[PDB]
Design a protein around this nucleic acid. Structure first.
Ligand SMILES: [Zn+2]
Ligand SMILES: [Zn+2]
Ligand SMILES: [Zn+2]
Ligand SMILES: [Zn+2]
Lengths: 73, 73
DNA sequence: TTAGTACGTGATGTTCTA
DNA sequence: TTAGAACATCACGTACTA
């Protein structure tokens, strides 16, 4: 509440169905749309925060879905 | 050997003191020269390979120093 | 309200030139 | 033989509009 559910950054309102920051809002749109497989370099449980969220699109995307984000309304 | 000591890609020669590919040669030069204080999102033990080496510069650089690479000061 | 655009920035990996 | 620069490409995050 005022904090992004994906990465803990300061949130700017709900986006695609969950409370997120602006960077996570645009990341989810880019990564949900694409037909990309993302690979985690560790164990699929990376810590996603303001400074680490860049490292692992796979875990960040997983967390977006887990927080309920969706492109299909 | 023909194998990059950092990421397992095909090596290109001895670079900065260790057998590495071309991408790891330029990465190490940029990483050692700049102090980006790279952060790992996991446990400082990421898998570094051709498909994952972009995920965790911090662990990739860790591997470079463990492999003996150095800028000669 | 929040989704879309488009920019500016920076990391990456190779080809080139020493 | 390898160091280093440059260019193209791409991921990222922001400001701005509606
Ligand atoms: Zn976020
Ligand atoms: Zn991960
Ligand atoms: Zn390598
Ligand atoms: Zn790591």
């Amino acid at each position: 509440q005022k904090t992004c559910l994906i990465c803990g950054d300061e949130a700017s309102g709900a986006h695609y169905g969950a409370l997120t920051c602006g960077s996570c809002k645009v990341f989810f749109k880019r990564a949900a749309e694409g037909k990309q497989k993302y690979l985690c370099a560790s164990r699929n449980d990376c810590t996603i925060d303001k400074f680490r969220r860049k490292n692992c699109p796979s875990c960040r995307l997983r967390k977006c879905y887990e927080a309920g984000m969706t492109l299909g309304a």
